[model samples]
Target: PKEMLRAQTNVILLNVLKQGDNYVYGIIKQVKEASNGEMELNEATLYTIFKRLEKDGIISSYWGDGRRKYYRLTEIGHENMRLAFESWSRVDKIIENLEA
Candidate 1:
């Protein structure tokens, strides 16, 4: 469960970025809405995830509309997002088997 939660956190951010470029607060809001308010992301955790992705070259940020910095995925980030989808699919299968 710990492992899955960690993976889900990364994947959730990546998946959200795939939808469109968004600033930190906007990203947080969108994620909350998508999850129906079930996932309330902490600011520090979100920042850590952003830093991790930026360092990995999976994402880049640019200052946009005043103080907000919007983040967008790189070419490799799109590929990584696809990989995340496939990975979660496998996780689903694993859970299915475990339950069976």
Candidate 2:
């Protein structure tokens, strides 16, 4: 269950970068808004994902105008997300079939 939750969290965070470069608070804010307050990530998990994604070449971050660290998706990240989406599509149908 933790593994699946992490997997979903990874995809969701990556999806946020699909819009534009965003800072930590902005990222969390957008995710909450997008999910209508149903999804929330604590600072620990959020920063961990940020570091892991950056180390994996899925994302890049830099200091912004102030003290904020902004993150953006790389080309590799986009491709990776695309592949994840494909898997999610299949998973969607599989769940539907199982439910039936």
Candidate 3:
């Protein structure tokens, strides 16, 4: 379940970063709003994922005004998002079929 949550969290984070520049807190806020608060990610988990993604070259971060750290999706990250969405759609379809 933690792995599932992390994957979903990464997808949400990537999509939000795709929107525009956003600080760490801002990203958290936007993601919660976007997911209708269903995500409920904690700070440690959030930053850990951010560091991992940055290390993997999927995303990059920089300091904004007032020492705020902002994140944006790299080209690789966008590609990952596309693949993630495809996988999610397939899973969703299967779940829906089972429900039917």
Please give the CA lDDT of all the candidate structures.
Answer: 0.89, 0.90, 0.83
Residue 25 in candidate 1 has what lDDT? 92
Candidate 3 lDDT over residue span 1-100, tens digit each? 9899777777777778889868778877877787798866677877998999999999898888658888888999889888978998999999999999
Clashes of each: 0, 0, 0
* lDDT by residue (tens digit), candidate 2, 1-100: 9999998898888888898899889888998999999998787898999899999999999898749989999999999888978998999999999999
Cα TM-score of candidate 3: 0.77
**Please, what are the lDDT tens digits per residue for candidate 1 over residues 22-98?**
88898889889999999999888888888989999999999986598899999999997788779979999999999
Error of 3 at 86 (Å): 3.8
Q: Candidate 3 — which pairs collide?
A: none
Give TM-scores for every candidate, taking all chains together and pairing residue i with residue i. Answer: 0.80, 0.83, 0.77
Descending-TM-score candidate ranking: 2, 1, 3
Judging by lDDT, tell me the better candidate of 1 and 3. Answer: 1
User: Over 4 Å off in model 2, which ranges?
Assistant: 90-100
Best by TM-score: 2
